[PDB]
Structure formats: C-alpha cells, structure tokens
Amino acid sequence: XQXXRXPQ
C-alpha cells in the first residue's frame, strides 16, 4: 500500500 510495492 506504499512506495509502489503495490501489496504494501
């Protein structure tokens, strides 16, 4: 959900 690490 953050930083482009789409799953986080």
Q: What is the DSSP string of 1-8?
A: -BTTBTT-
Taking the C-alpha atoms of residue 7 and residue 1, their distance in angstroms, rounded to an integer, is 5
Experimentally, the structure was elucidated by NMR
The token pair at 8 is 């986080």
Contacts for 7 with CB less than 8 Å, ≥ 6 apart: 1
